[PDB]
Amino acid sequence: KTEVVLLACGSFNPITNMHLRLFELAKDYMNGTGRYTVVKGIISPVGDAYKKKGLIPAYHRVIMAELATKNSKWVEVDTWESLQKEWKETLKVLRHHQEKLEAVPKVKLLCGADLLESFAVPNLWKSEDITQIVANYGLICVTRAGNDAQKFIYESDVLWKHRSNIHVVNEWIANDISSTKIRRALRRGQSIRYLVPDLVQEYIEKHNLYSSESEDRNAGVILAPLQRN
Amino acid sequence: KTEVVLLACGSFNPITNMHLRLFELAKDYMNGTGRYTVVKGIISPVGDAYKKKGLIPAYHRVIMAELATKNSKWVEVDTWESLQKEWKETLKVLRHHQEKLEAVPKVKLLCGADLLESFAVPNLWKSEDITQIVANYGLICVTRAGNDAQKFIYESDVLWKHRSNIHVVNEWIANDISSTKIRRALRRGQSIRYLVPDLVQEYIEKHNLYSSESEDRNAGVILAPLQRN
Amino acid sequence: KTEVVLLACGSFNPITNMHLRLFELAKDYMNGTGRYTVVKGIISPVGDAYKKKGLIPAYHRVIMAELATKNSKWVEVDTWESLQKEWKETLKVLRHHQEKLVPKVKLLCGADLLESFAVPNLWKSEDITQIVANYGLICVTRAGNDAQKFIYESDVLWKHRSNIHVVNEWIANDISSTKIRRALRRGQSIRYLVPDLVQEYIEKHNLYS
Amino acid sequence: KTEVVLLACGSFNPITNMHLRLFELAKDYMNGTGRYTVVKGIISPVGDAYKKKGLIPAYHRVIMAELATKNSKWVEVDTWESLQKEWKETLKVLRHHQEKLEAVPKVKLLCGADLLESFAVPNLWKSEDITQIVANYGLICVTRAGNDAQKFIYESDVLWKHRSNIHVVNEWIANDISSTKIRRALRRGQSIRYLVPDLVQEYIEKHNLYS
Amino acid sequence: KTEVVLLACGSFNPITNMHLRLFELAKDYMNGTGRYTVVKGIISPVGDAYKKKGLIPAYHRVIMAELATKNSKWVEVDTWESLQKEWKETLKVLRHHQEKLEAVPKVKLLCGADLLESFAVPNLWKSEDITQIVANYGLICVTRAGNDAQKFIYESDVLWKHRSNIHVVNEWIANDISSTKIRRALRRGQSIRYLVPDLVQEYIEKHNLYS
Amino acid sequence: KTEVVLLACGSFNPITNMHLRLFELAKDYMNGTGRYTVVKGIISPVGDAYKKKGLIPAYHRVIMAELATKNSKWVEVDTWESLQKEWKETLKVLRHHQEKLVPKVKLLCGADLLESFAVPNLWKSEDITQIVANYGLICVTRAGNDAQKFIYESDVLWKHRSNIHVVNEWIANDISSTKIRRALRRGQSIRYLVPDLVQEYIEKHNLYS
Amino acid sequence: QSDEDVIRLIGQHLNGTVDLLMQEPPRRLQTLLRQAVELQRDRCLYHNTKLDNNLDSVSLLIDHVCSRRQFPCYTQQILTEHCNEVWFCKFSNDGTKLATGSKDTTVIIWQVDPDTHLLKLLKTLEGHAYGVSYIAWSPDDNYLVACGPDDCSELWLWNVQTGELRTKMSQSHEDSLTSVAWNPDGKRFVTGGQRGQFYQCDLDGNLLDSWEGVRVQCLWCLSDGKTVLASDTHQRIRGYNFEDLTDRNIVQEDHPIMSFTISKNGRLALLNVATQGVHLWDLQDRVLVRKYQGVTQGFYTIHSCFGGHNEDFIASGSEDHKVYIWHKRSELPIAELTGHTRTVNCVSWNPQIPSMMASASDDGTVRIWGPAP
Amino acid sequence: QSDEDVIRLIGQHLNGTVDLLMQEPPRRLQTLLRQAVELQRDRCLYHNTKLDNNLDSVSLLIDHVCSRRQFPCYTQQILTEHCNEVWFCKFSNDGTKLATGSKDTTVIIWQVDPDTHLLKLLKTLEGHAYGVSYIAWSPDDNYLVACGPDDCSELWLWNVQTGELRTKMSQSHEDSLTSVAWNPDGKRFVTGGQRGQFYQCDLDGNLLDSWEGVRVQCLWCLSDGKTVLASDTHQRIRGYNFEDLTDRNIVQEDHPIMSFTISKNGRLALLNVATQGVHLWDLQDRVLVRKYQGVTQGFYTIHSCFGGHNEDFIASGSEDHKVYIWHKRSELPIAELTGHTRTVNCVSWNPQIPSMMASASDDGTVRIWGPAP
Ligand SMILES: [Zn+2]
Ligand SMILES: [Zn+2]
DSSP states (O other), X not given: OEEEEEEEOSOXXXXXXXXXXXXXXXXXXXXXXXXXXXXXXXXXXXXXXXXXXXXXXXXXXXXXXXXXXXXXXXXXXXXXXXXXXXXXXXXXXXXXXXXXXXXXXXXXXXXXXXXXHHTTSTTSSOHHHHHHIIIIIOEEEEEXXXXXXXXXXXXXSHHHHTGGGEEEEEOXXXXXXXXXXXXXXXXXXXXXXXTSOHHHHHHHHHHTOOSHHHHSSOOSOOXXXXXXX | OEEEEEEEOSOOTTXXXXXXXXXXXXXXXXXXXXXXXXXXXXXXXXXXXXXXXXXXXXXXXXXXXXXXXXXXXXXEOOXXXXXXXXXXXXHHHHHHHHHHTTOOOEEEEEEOHHHHHHTTSTTSSOHHHHHHIIIIIOEEEEESOHHHHHXXXXXXXXXXXXXGGEEEEEOOSOBOOOHHHHHHHHHHTOOOBTTBOHHHHHHHHHHTOOSHHHHTTSOSOOOHHHHHO | OEEEEEEEOOOOSSOOHHHHHHHHHHHHHHHHTSSEEEEEEEEOOXXXXXXXXXXXXXXXXXXXXXXXXXXXXXXXXXXXXXXXXXXXXXXXXXXXXHHHOOOEEEEEEOHHHHHHTTSTTOSOHHHHHHIIIIIOEEEEESOSHHHHHHHHHOHHHHHTGGGEEEEEOOSOBOOOHHHHHHHHHTXXXXXXXXXXXXXXXXXXXXXXX | OEEEEEEEEEOOSSOOHHHHHHHHHHHHHHHHXXXXXXXXXXXXXXXXXXXXXXXXXXXXXXXXXXXXTTSOSSEEEOXXXXXXXXXXXXXXXXXXXXXXXXXXXXXXXXXXXXXXXXXXXXXXXXXXXXXXXXXXXXXXXXESOHHHHHHHXXXXXXXXXXXXXXXXXXXXXXXXXXXXXXXXXXXTTOOOBTTBOHHHHHHHHHHTOOO | OEEEEEEEEEOOSSOOHXXXXXXXXXXXXHHHTTSEEEEEEEEEEOOTTSOOSSOOOHHHHHHHHHHHTTSOSSEEEOOTTTSOSSOOOHHHHHHHHHHHHHOOOEEEEEEOSHXXXXXXXXXXXXXXXXXXXXXXXXXXXXESOHHHHHHHHHHOHHHHHXXXXXXXXXXXXXXXXXXXXXXXXXXTTOOOBTTBOHHHHHHHHHHTOOO | OEEEEEEEOOOOSSOOHHHHHHHHHHHHHHHHTSSEXXXXXXXXXXXXXGOOSSOXXXXXXXXXXXXXXXXXXXXXXXXXXXXXXXXXXXXHHHXXXXXXXXXXXXXEEOHHHHHHTTSTTOSOHHHHHHIIIIIOEEEEESOSHXXXXXXXXXXXXXXXXXGEEEEEOOSOBOOOHHXXXXXXXXXXXXXXXXOHHHHHHHHHHTOOO | OHHHHHHHHHHHHTTOXXXXXXXXOOXXXXXXXXXXXXXXXXXXXXXXXXXXXXXOOOOSSXXXXXXXXXXXXXXXXXXXXXXXXXXXEEEOTTSSEEEEEESSSOEEEEEEETTTTEEEEEEEEOOOSSOOOXXXXXXXXXXXXXXXXXTOOOBEEOOTTTOOOOOOBOSOSSOOOOEEEEOTTSSEEEEEOSSSOEEEEETTSOEEEEEOSOOOSOEEEOTTSSEEEXXXXXXXXXXEETTTTEEEEEEEOSSOEEEEEEXXXXXXXXXXXXXXXXXXXXXXXXXEEEEEOOOOXXXXXXXXXXXXXXXXXXXXXXXXXXXXXXXXXXXXXXXXXXXXXXXXXXXXXXXXXXTOEEOOBSSSOOOEEEEOO | OHHHHHHHHHHHHXXXXXXXXXXXXXXXXXXXXXXXXXXXXXXXXXXXOSSSSSOOOOOSSSOOOOOSSSSEEEEEEOOOOOSSOEEEEEEOTTSSEEEEEESSSOEEEEEEETTTTEEEXXXXXXXXXXXXXXXXXXXXXXXXXXXXXXXXXXXXEOOTTTOOOOOOBOSOSSOOOOEEEEOTTSSEEEEEOSSSOEEEEETTSOEEEEEOSOOOSOEEEOTTSSEEEEEOSSSEEXXXXXXXXXEEEEEEOSSOEEEEEEOTTSOEEEXXXXXXXXXXXXXTTTEEEEEEOOOOOSSSOOBEEXXXXXXXXXXXXXXXXXXXXXXXXOSSOSBOOOOOSSOBOBOEEOSSSTTOEEOOBSSSOOOEEEEOO
C-alpha cells in the first residue's frame, strides 16, 4: 500500500464541525478503497497577508484550531504558513510540507466544492500552478453534489487529462454549517452550541471576538492573490 | 410574562445533534419574541410497546439520552412514559406531565416537520385528540422549509382556527443528520464522530448495539397506534 | 386594540384588481391578528415630476383611481403627491400624512420593495431604519420563504423584525401593470381584469395605443 | 371563414372571474387566428342529479350565473341541462345544442387543462365517445402551462390522429381562482371582493349560501 | 396548397445527425399540416470570412457536408455562400436564393431555439432586418422545449405582430449532439461512431482534422 | 491488464443508435481505466418464449441485429437465447457464455436495471449477490448521482461496490425503443435515428404499422 | 542545655532514689514516647487499624512493623474446571464455602479444608439456561439465590445442604431479574431488574410487595431490617422504605454506577464508576472520601470488595488482566499483582480467614491467592 | 514490663553513678526523641523548611510551633492613586521598591520605609499610550523595562535613578512585544511577542539576534547565562540556546499556559493553567508535582508567585475577588482572605522582607498585606 498525508489549508475563521467531519470522511474513503493508508492530517490556517474581508488575527484562529483538535489522535495544527511575512501560494506550502516530510508518505490536498469551482475564476490561478498541483501531488474533494464536480472536471482539459489523480468523495449525511452563517448568528446573539466544540465556543464568548467592527474591517481591498497576479 | 416548559416525546434511537439544537433554537425564539420565558425542557423516549421497526430496548436509549444531556443546565430526561405496560397516547403523557407540574408553567409540545405532516395520515390521529392538543397546550415546530408548514396549516380547518397557538420557527443553519442515516453508517462500519456526543458514541461501540440482527427485528408488525385505532 | 391606517404609495398606471385584493387581504389579516383595528386606507399615486417612461399625466391616473374606489366603503384616494412640483421622498410623504392625521400609519408593499432595500448603495441606511422603526411594514407576498430570507440576511431588518408583518397569499393573482399595458397596446380585451368603470374610461379616452 | 359557437359546461359552484376570462381569451384567440368568426357563448351548469360534492341546489347556481352575465352581451345561460331528471354525458349536450342551432354554425367545446388528463385515465371514457367528441365538434384548451397539454395530446393516439381539430391557447396572466379555494374562503368568513363580480358577491352575502 | 423550399445556414463544423434530423422533422411537420408541399432543402455553410472560432477551412466543411448528403435525395449543398470574399448577412442569402429560384416557391428559413433568443439582445439585429425576415419569408423553429420559444415570441412586438408567419415544431426525441461537444470528443481522441454518418467519420479519421 | 468481454442482454425491438453508442462508450471507459482490455462484445436478444406484448418473432430481431452490427469490427451477435424453447434466467445465460468462452464476462445495462434490483420482492437476494460478485456490472447512465444513490441505499450493492463501475454520459441520446415504435406506427420518418440497412429492412417488410 | 534538659526530664520521670540523683510541666517524658509511637504507626505500610489503634501497649526496644507474610501475593491454585467463563465468585458468610458462577450452566461449590486452607469441589448445580451473573448467600448460608444475565426472566433458589432446587420464581415471561438481596430476617428477599421490576418476595415463591418507576441495577438490604438501598439510572443511590412507601436521596454522581458494596458497619459505600475507577462515599455525611487512582474500566461491569482485618484493604479487578489492592489511606495502588490472561471481573476476599482471596477471570480460572511461600 | 524497659533504657542513656542505679541495641532513647521531634515538625501548620529541617537542635520541654504573627492576613494600606485599573505590580530585587503598572499611562514607584514598613510614592513615569501590562526589573534594580498590551509595537526602558526615558525600542510598526526578560549579565534583554517576534537585544537599542517560527507568550532567562525558557502556543515550555541555535523540550500540558514563574533555585516552575488552577513542575525529572485545588480562572491572564522563607508558600489571585495562599505540601488552600471588589490578577510577594505582600485589583487598588495587629 501507499501512505498518504492529508493537508488542509483554508481560513478556519472559526473552525466548525464540518472541518473535522471532512477529515473523517476522507480517511474512511481512502482506507476503504484498499489502495491507501492515511496516517496524518494537517490544518494550516492562512496568514493575515491574505487581506480577506473580516479576518481576525492569526493567533486567535490558531489557538481555536488547537483547542478543537485536542482529542483527535491523528490531526495536527502545524502553523508554518501563517508566520510568513508575505502571502504564500498553495504550491509553495505544499512543496514546503512535502520536503519537510523527507529531511515516505505523499501529501495530498484536501478540498471542497468551493475551491474546485474557484479554479474557473479568471486571474485567480496560474495554469502552470494548476497542472503542477493536479499532476504532482493530488486532490481530494468532498461534495454535496457529485455530478457538479464530475461536470466541472469534464469541461476543462488539464483536469480531464490528470483525472486519475482527482478522487471525488460523496457524502450523504448532510452538514453545511458554513463559517459566514456561524459569524452572523454569533453577531446577533444566538447560541452556536452543538455546531462547534465546546472549548472553542467558551473561548469565543470569553474574548468577544466577533462583532460588527471586526466584520467590517476589510472593505474594497483587493484580495491578495489578485493583486500579486 | 408566561413560563413555558418544552416537552419532546419521540424515538431518540439514537440521540443526535439535532435533538439538542432543536431545544436551543426553540429557547432562542421564545425568549426573543418578548412574550415567553422558557425554564425547562424534557426528553421522553417512547416505550417498547410502540412496536416500531428496529427499536432497541428502552433502557439503552434512556441511558444514551442521559449521557447526552450531562452538561446542559435546563434539560431533563424524565422517563415516566417508557415504563408503562401499555402504549400511551400523546395527549395522556402531556396531561400527566402538566398535572405533575402542579401537584405555574405551561407545557408545550416540541415538534418537527414529520409530525405535522403525519397529522394527515388516515387512521393515525383522532380528531378530538388533535383539537385538544392544538387548543389546550400548544405546538412548536422547527422546519427547513417554512412555507411547507404554513401551507399544511392552511389546508386544514382546525389548525387554521387554532393557528394563534402554533408557532413556526425557521432555521437557516442546516442540519439533517437523521437517525436512519446514522444507523446505516454505523452498520457498515463508518465513523459517526462529530455527529453525536462522544460519550454516546463510545457507549455505542462498547455494547455493539446496532447491527443487521437488531435492524430486522420488527417486520410487518402493525404499528401500535394503528392496531389500537 | 390600536388604530392603524394603511397607506399605498405606488405608480398605479393603471389600477387593477390585485391592488384592491391587497387592501382586502391586509385588512383581514390585521383584524384577525387580535391586537389591531383598521380604520382607513389611502392610495397616493406618484406625481408626474418623476419624469419616467410610460407614465401618463397624473390627473388621468387620479381620475382612474377615483372611479375604481368609488364603490368601496373604507378606501380613499389622496391627491397631494400629484400636485407637488418637486419629487419628494417616501419618508417625507409618510411624515406628511402622519402629521395631517391617534392612529398610526403603516406602509403597504410587496416583495419588490423589500428586495429593493438590498440593492447595492441606493437607499441610505438611516432612511431605512427610520421607515422601518417609526412606521412599519406590511409585506403581502405570493411567496413566504423569500421575505423571511431577505429579513434574515439584512441586519437592520432583523434588528427591527418586530415591526414587519409578512402576509402569505394563497390565491394566484399576478395582474401586473406592465402586462395590462402590453395587452392594451395590441387591442386585446381586458374585461374582467380591471373594474368596469375604469375599463370603459380607458376604452373611451384611448389612453394606450 | 366559418362561424363558431363556444359552449362551456361544469358545475360553477360558484362562478368566478376565471371562467369569464376563459371566454374572453378563447374569443380573442379564435378571432385572431384569421379563420373563424365567434358569434355566441353558452354556459351550461350541471343539474341536481350528479353525485353530491358539496353542491348547492341548481336554481341558486343558475341565478348566480345569470347575475354574472347580465352585463355581458354575447354570453347566454342555458338551463336545459339543469332541468333534467337524469345525469347527461357532455356528448348529449353537444348534440342537443347543435340540433337546436340547426333548427348552421359549428359548436366548439371549451375546457381547461384537466379534461385532457381525464381523457387518459383508464375505464372512465369510452373510445367512441372521445372519437365523436374530437372528430365532430372539437375542443379548445386554455392552459397555464402549454407544454403539458401538448405532451398529453402527443401520447394519446386518437388525439394525435385528430390533432388538427384540437386548439391550445396560452394564458400569460397568472390568475386561477379555483372554486374550491374560494369556497374555503367563504367558509371561514373572509372577504372575496374583487375576485367575483360585485352582484354575485352581494347575492352571496344576502342569501348566506355557504356556512 | 403551396410549394415551399427549406433553407438552413450555419457553420457545420462538423456536420452531425442533429441537422439531418432537423430537416426530417421540419419536412414531416410541414407536410402534416395539410397546407404545404415541401420540395427541396438547401444547406449553406459559412465561408472563410467570419471571425475565427476554431473554424477549419471552408472546402473541408463543404466536402464533409456533400459526403453526408450523398445518400439523401432532396437535400442539396449550395457553395455560393462559401465562395465569397465578404461576410454576408443571412437576409442577403435568402434574397439571392429566392432570386435564383424565381429565375416560384417561397423560401422558409430553418433555425433552432437560439435564433429567437438572439433576436432580442440589444444592438445586434436591426428592426428592419427582422421585419423583412419574418414578413417576407418566415421561420421554422425546431426546439426541445416549446414553452420558451412561445415566451420569446410573446414578448417581442414584431414577432407577435407577425406571429402567423412563425412556426414552432416540437422534438420528442432528446438528442442534441452539439458541435462543441463532438469537437471536444475529437480533441481527446475518443470515438464518435454512430453519432456522425459513417463516411464523415472515415473522412475525419483519414485527414486528422482536429488535434 | 485483464481480458474482459462485454455482454448485452436486452429485448432489442428494434435496435437503434444508442445501443452501439453504449458499446463504444463502455469500451472507451474500460480501456481508459488503465487496468483493463476489452476484446469482444456480444449482443444476445431475448427469445420469444417470454410471451410479452409487442414482441415480434425472434428471427426478425436477430436478422435486424445482424444487419446493424455488420460493419463493426469487434461486436458480434449470439443466437442461443432465441432458439431456446423455455424462458431462462439472466444468471443462467451469463454462466452459459462464461463456460462457452481466460477473459471474464461483464454485463452492460443502464439505470433501469439497477433500479429494478430494488423493487419490492421480485429478485432473490442470492441471485443478486451472485450476479454482482461473480461477474460485475457496467452502468452507463445519463445521470450520475442516481446510480450512486441506488448503490448507497442497497446494502448488498454497497457491500460489493468494488465490482460495479458507473460511466457518466455527457451527450444526450435518448432514442428509446418505445418512441421509435410509436413513430413508426404513424408513418413518421425515422431516418438517421436507426442504421440505414435496418431502416430499409423495416420499410421493406412493414414490420410495424 | 539539651543534655541537662533530658537529665531533668528523666529524673522527674524516675520519681514515679532521685534525691541523690539530683546532686549527681506535667508528665512530659511519656508523651514524647507516645508521639514517637504514633509516628512509628504512621510510617507502617501494611497497617492494621484494630487493637493497634487507640492503645498504649506497644514495646519500645524495636520499631513497629506489621507482617506482610500474611498477605495475598502468591498464586496457589488454578481451579480450571469450568468451560466458557467464570462470571462470578463469592465466599459464604461463614468462610467455609465458595460459590463460583460460570457462563454456561453451572454454579459450583468449593469447600475449604481448615487444616490446610485448600479448596475441593463439593457439589454442582445445573439447569440454568442463560448463565449465572449474580449470587447471594443466605444469612446462615443455607440457601443461595442465583440470577443470570439481563434477559433472564426467572431466578433459581437452591439448597446448599443437598443441592435440590427449591421453588423457582417467575412472575411473567416478559420480565428481567438481575439483582437480589437477602433480608436480615432470613426469610425474604428483594429482587430487581433493569426493565423496572422491583419486588419484595417470600421464600416459598409468593409475592409480598412491589414498586414501579425505578430501574434498579444493584440492591442492598440494610441492617435496620426496613431500608433497602437501590441504584437508579440517573446516577444515584436511593434509600427506599416499605410499609412507609418513602424514599430519600443520599448519593449523586456524574457517571453510571456499575456496582456497589456496603461495609459490615453499614457506614461506607465502595462503588465502581464507569470511565473512572473506584470511589468511597460516607452515607452519614453524604460525602465522597477517596478517589483511588488507576483501573482500566470502560462501560463494563466489574466488581470490587473490602478485605483485611477491620475492613482495611480494598481489592478490585480491571481490564488490564491484573488485580489491584489498595490500603485505605493512599491514592496509589499497593500491589499490582498479575497472572491472568483475559479480563478480571469478580475478585473477592474471604470474610473470616484474612489471608484468602479469589480471582475469577474471563478464560475460566478461579485463581486463589494466599500468603507468599 | 514497659516500666522496666523504660527504666533500662534510661539507665543505659545515663551511662553517657548508674552502678547503684542498676541495683536500685545501640543508643535507643535518643532516636525515640528524634522521631517525636519529627512528628512535631510534621504536625506544624505554617512551617518553615530552613534551619528547622535536617537539624537536631530543638528544645523538648514545649511542643514545636511556628509563629503566625509574621504572616500576611490583615490589610494595612489601600494605595488608591491610579484612575482606571492596576494591571501589574512587582517588587524590586532589593525589596526596597515597588512598581505598579496601571491601565492608562502610568507606572508608579513606591518606596518603603524600613523603620515602619510603610510605602510612599516616590516618582512617576508617563508617556505610555496603550497602558502597561508587564514590568521587568534589572538585576541591580537600576532600570525597568515596561511593555503594554498585545498590540503595543514599542517598549519603554526607564532609569529608576532619575526617571528619564532612555532609548525606547521599536523595530517595526507592524509588531507586537508583550514579554521581556533580563540577562544575568545585566546588559541585554530578550523580548518576545504573540505575533512571532522573539528577539535578543542590547541596552542602547540595537538588535543582536532573533528567531522565527515560535509565538512566545512568556520568557525567562536562566542562571546559566545562555538558556532561555519560552512558552509556546502548543501548550509547551521549551528551552532555547543561542550561539548554538538549539532547542529542547521539557514541559507539555493539555491546556494553554497563561503564565509561569521560576524559583530562585532554578529547579521548579509554578504555572497557571486555563480552566484549571495552579500547577508545579520539576524540570530535572520533567514531572508534575502538585495540582493545587481551587481558583476561578477561565481564559484570563492571572499571575501568581512564590513566597515565604525558602520559597515555602505559594500565593495566587483569582476571579473570585479573593486572594489564595497555599503551603507547599497541601491540596487545600491555607487562607482564602478577601477584601477586593473586582478581580485580582497580579498578586506579588516581597523578595527580601518575608511579611509584605501586594495585591493589585481591577478597580484601582494596590492593597498591601502584612502581619495581623
Ligand atoms: Zn502496623
Ligand atoms: Zn514549624
